């Protein structure tokens, strides 16, 4: 079983406040509300703060994470994480019997998470609660 | 659960024939596949409260019909025919998979890659797409009402026109989308669609309704018995505007 299938909680990271950032004198950029034009090439993968106006709010679309394929012959659930659907079964029962069963995607066995697109322009993807 | 109700309703039909002892054809009744159409549930969640954990769940929807699309044929039983010995076959489609035969079933033929698929001799099914709009009574102030796709099958097609208030209480399924029309890749987003099971307007007809409460009907008749009904309803319709009786 994949670890993402059992994780039912959405971990978040709250930035530091203006009171705790004054005593810490070691790169206090994550606590300052930066703009969109100030985002250079060195801020990739960093926890920054973007201040603006949210425009074009999309709907709540369920996004899958782990797709489980239920076979018809052996009946095994092949989990695949999403960061191409699997058609051939990778179980040992379908390889020893020389009978490659068709993998059927089970919607009930797949975990789906929330996904919403927002524009501040800069695209903002909201996931979770 | 619906698949179980379709089988329990078949055994109950046979028990009613033996208990009545009628001279009817038992083979014509057992071969008919009966379907159950549940509706009017308690989970009346809107289009905005569609949580991702409600995959394949019957949720009642109370919206309005926007447009109407023509009937699209859906293949159910494929038809194959050989090109040498002319051997007609009938292979059913299971879970949207058309298992084509590799070799011919005839002993005199037995030629690989010799079966031709004839789409004109296949049993198609009715499929209609109905665009449902959200009810403005439930949409909060400052937001735009969205839409959703509905799938109508069986003989329930051609029953919902534009500008009609219906009640769709069907399952909430989802189908994946492809990133390219020539490749077999799939995107991360899944197209959500509600499979229509029963159509209750707000074919067949409603036999009765069970709105409001019978306890409120006693209070309704209490005000109707009073002689000051024309003056009490005139003041409650606008208590912020003086005069204008």
């Amino acid at each position: 079983f994949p670890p993402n299938l059992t994780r039912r909680y959405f971990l978040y990271f709250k930035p530091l406040s203006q009171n705790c950032a004054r005593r810490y004198r070691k790169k206090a950029i994550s606590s300052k509300p930066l703009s969109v034009r100030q985002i250079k090439g060195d801020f990739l993968g960093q926890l920054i703060t973007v201040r603006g106006i949210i425009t074009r709010v999309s709907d709540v679309k369920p996004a899958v994470e782990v797709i489980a394929y239920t076979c018809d012959q052996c009946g095994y659930e092949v989990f695949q994480e999403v960061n191409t659907p699997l058609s051939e079964c990778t179980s040992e029962e379908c390889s020893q019997n020389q009978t490659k069963g068709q993998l059927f995607m089970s919607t009930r066995a797949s975990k789906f998470s929330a996904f919403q697109e927002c524009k501040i322009s800069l695209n903002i993807h909201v996931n979770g609660t | 659960v619906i698949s179980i109700m379709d089988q329990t309703i078949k055994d109950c039909m046979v028990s009613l024939i033996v208990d009545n002892n009628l001279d009817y054809d038992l083979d014509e009744i057992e071969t008919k596949f009966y379907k159950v159409r549940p509706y009017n549930v308690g989970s009346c969640k809107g289009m905005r409260e569609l949580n991702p954990n409600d995959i394949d769940k019957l949720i009642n929807l109370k919206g309005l019909v926007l447009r109407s699309t023509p009937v699209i044929p859906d293949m159910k039983v494929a038809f194959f025919k050989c090109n040498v010995c002319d051997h007609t076959m009938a292979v059913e489609i299971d879970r949207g998979v058309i298992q084509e035969p590799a070799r011919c079933e005839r002993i005199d033929c037995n030629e690989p890659n010799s079966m031709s698929l004839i789409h004109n001799r296949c049993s198609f099914a009715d499929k209609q797409v109905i665009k449902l709009q959200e009810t403005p009574d439930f949409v909060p102030d400052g937001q735009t009402p969205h839409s959703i796709s509905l799938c109508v099958y069986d003989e329930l097609v051609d029953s919902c026109r534009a500008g009609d208030r219906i009640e769709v209480t069907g399952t909430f399924r989802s189908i994946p989308i492809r990133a390219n029309s020539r490749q077999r890749v799939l995107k991360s987003l899944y197209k959500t669609y509600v499979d229509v099971v029963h159509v209750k307007k707000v074919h067949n007809e409603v036999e009765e309704v069970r709105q409001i409460t019978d306890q409120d009907l006693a209070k309704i008749r209490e005000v109707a018995a009073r002689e000051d009904l024309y003056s009490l309803l005139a003041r409650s319709i606008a208590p912020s505007i003086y005069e204008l009786e």
Side-chain angles (χ1 to χ4, degrees), chain A residues 1-111 113-129, chain B residues 1-56 58-59 61-145 147-154 156-164 166-168 170-185 187-245:
Chain A
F1 291 116
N4 290 325
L5 201 133
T6 56
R7 281 164 187 178
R8 285 167 150 276
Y9 57 94
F10 295 100
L11 195 131
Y12 299 127
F13 278 116
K14 187 193 188 180
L16 301 105
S17 184
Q18 292 179 357
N19 290 346
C20 297
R22 194 176 174 187
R23 301 178 181 181
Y24 207 67
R25 216 179 185 165
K26 276 181 175 181
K27 289 182 179 177
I29 322 168
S30 61
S31 64
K32 283 176 188 183
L34 298 176
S35 72
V36 191
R37 207 169 299 213
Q38 285 169 343
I39 304 174
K40 289 181 183 184
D42 56 338
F43 293 123
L44 267 83
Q46 301 193 8
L47 191 76
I48 63 172
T49 41
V50 184
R51 178 174 59 180
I53 301 163
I54 305 149
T55 52
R56 305 173 189 184
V57 177
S58 174
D59 282 320
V60 182
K61 300 173 186 169
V64 86
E65 290 181 350
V66 180
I67 303 173
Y69 304 98
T70 51
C71 186
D72 198 37
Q73 291 183 350
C74 67
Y76 266 95
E77 297 191 359
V78 179
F79 304 102
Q80 183 186 16
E81 299 196 331
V82 181
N83 294 340
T84 303
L86 295 168
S87 54
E88 301 188 354
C89 193
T90 52
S91 67
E92 47 162 30
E93 287 192 349
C94 282
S95 192
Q96 288 177 17
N97 289 325
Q98 294 186 355
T99 40
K100 295 188 179 190
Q102 179 64 38
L103 285 181
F104 293 103
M105 177 183 72
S106 182
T107 49
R108 290 186 291 183
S110 54
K111 182 189 175 205
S113 59
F115 175 74
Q116 192 174 31
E117 294 185 345
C118 294
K119 299 189 176 183
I120 197 167
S121 59
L122 182 72
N123 293 338
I124 294 176
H125 295 166
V126 192
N127 289 337
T129 311
Chain B
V1 183
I2 294 167
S3 297
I4 295 172
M5 303 324 195
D6 296 337
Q7 193 61 42
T8 56
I9 201 176
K10 180 175 168 170
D11 303 337
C12 189
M13 184 55 211
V14 187
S15 71
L16 283 170
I17 303 161
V18 189
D19 286 344
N20 287 297
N21 289 307
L22 291 170
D23 300 320
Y24 276 103
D25 295 332
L26 267 86
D27 48 352
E28 295 188 349
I29 310 175
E30 283 176 15
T31 42
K32 205 178 187 193
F33 304 107
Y34 296 107
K35 298 172 178 181
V36 189
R37 289 175 179 175
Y39 74 104
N40 198 29
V41 303
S43 164
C44 197
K45 306 167 179 173
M47 259 55 63
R48 304 180 184 279
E49 301 180 338
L50 289 179
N51 281 307
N53 62 351
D54 295 318
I55 290 175
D56 297 321
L58 201 143
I59 301 141
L61 308 180
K62 287 181 175 178
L64 196 82
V65 181
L66 183 70
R67 62 180 195 161
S68 304
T69 66
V71 183
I72 302 173
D74 207 5
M75 195 185 293
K76 186 181 184 176
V77 179
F79 200 90
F80 284 100
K81 187 192 176 205
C82 184
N83 288 335
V84 178
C85 67
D86 290 321
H87 184 64
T88 56
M89 287 180 56
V91 181
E92 53 191 343
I93 307 176
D94 277 358
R95 301 110 170 276
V97 179
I98 308 177
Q99 185 62 42
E100 49 188 358
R103 296 182 180 187
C104 190
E105 286 191 345
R106 201 163 189 161
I107 317 172
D108 309 320
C109 184
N110 267 324
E111 283 193 9
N113 307 333
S114 54
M115 298 302 287
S116 68
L117 177 78
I118 302 183
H119 49 80
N120 285 346
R121 287 192 179 181
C122 292
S123 180
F124 289 92
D126 286 320
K127 173 175 62 204
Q128 198 180 29
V129 184
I130 301 182
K131 196 172 176 188
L132 181 127
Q133 198 173 4
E134 279 174 56
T135 318
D137 308 337
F138 295 107
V139 174
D141 296 325
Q143 299 188 10
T144 58
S147 66
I148 210 155
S149 305
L150 308 178
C151 282
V152 182
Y153 296 96
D154 300 333
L156 274 179
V157 300
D158 204 67
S159 64
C160 309
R161 305 189 183 204
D164 288 340
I166 59 172
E167 179 171 12
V168 182
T171 73
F172 182 70
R173 299 186 188 197
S174 65
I175 36 168
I177 56 180
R178 293 182 288 197
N180 200 357
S181 307
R182 298 186 69 188
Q183 293 179 340
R184 295 193 293 208
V185 290
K187 294 179 160 171
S188 309
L189 292 178
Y190 271 53
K191 184 175 180 185
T192 57
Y193 74 104
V194 172
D195 184 29
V196 182
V197 185
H198 180 90
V199 175
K200 180 183 180 183
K201 292 177 178 172
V202 184
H203 184 39
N204 214 244
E205 200 186 359
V206 43
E207 77 277 15
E208 47 93 6
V209 290
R210 289 304 295 277
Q211 311 172 0
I212 57 171
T213 322
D214 261 335
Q215 293 188 11
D216 297 317
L217 277 182
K219 196 177 182 174
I220 280 166
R221 291 171 200 128
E222 185 190 354
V223 188
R226 289 192 276 176
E227 205 174 352
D228 294 333
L229 187 136
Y230 207 42
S231 187
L232 193 82
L233 284 178
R235 293 169 188 182
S236 53
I237 206 66
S240 60
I241 302 178
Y242 201 51
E243 295 203 319
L244 272 82
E245 294 191 353

